[PDB]
């Protein structure tokens, strides 16, 4: 009826081109949080925009993946995106 994978792709695509590069560099440069596993660069860089959403939903899960998606926007100063993201995020 409505795959969410296509929805997240529209968000990472609706971001600015220069901001797109900052989202990946910030993800690969993610510091350790608690014995967390570092994301292999060859996997993320080789992962396409659609495939990228598959590693976040498949490896981190829909609950944790969203936590990383919202916490990163506040980092690049995009609080306005959190107000809309919370309204467009399905329950």
Dist. CA 80–CA 72, nearest whole Å: 13
CATH number for the domain harbouring residue 60: 1.10.533.10
Residue whose pair of structure tokens reads 């506040």 in the numeric block: 74
Domains held by the chain: number: 1
Residue whose pair of structure tokens reads 């309204």 in the numeric block: 87
Distances (CA, A) of 40 to 29, 66, 76: 11, 20, 22
For the stretch 33-37, contacts whose Cβ atoms lie closer than 8 Å and that sit 24 or more positions apart, written own/partner, are none
Buried b (16+ CB within 10 A) or exposed e, 1-34: eeeeeeebbeebeebeeeeeeebeeeeeeeeeee
Element (H, E) at 49: helix 49-55
* Cα Rg, the chain, nearest whole Å: 13
Question: What is the 8-class DSSP label of residue 37?
Answer: P
- Structural domain boundaries, residue 81: 1-91
Extract the tokens encoding 44: 């993320």
Element (H, E) at 16: none
């Amino acid at each position: 009826m409505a795959s969410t994978r296509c929805k997240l792709a529209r968000y990472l695509e609706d971001l600015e081109d220069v901001d797109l590069k900052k989202f990946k560099m910030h993800l690969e440069d993610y510091p350790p949080q608690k014995g967390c596993i570092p994301l292999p660069r060859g996997q993320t860089e080789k992962a396409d925009h659609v495939d990228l959403a598959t590693l976040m939903i498949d490896f981190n899960g829909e609950e944790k993946a969203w936590a990383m998606a919202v916490w990163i926007f506040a980092a690049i100063n995009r609080r306005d995106l959190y107000e809309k993201a919370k309204r467009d995020e399905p329950k």
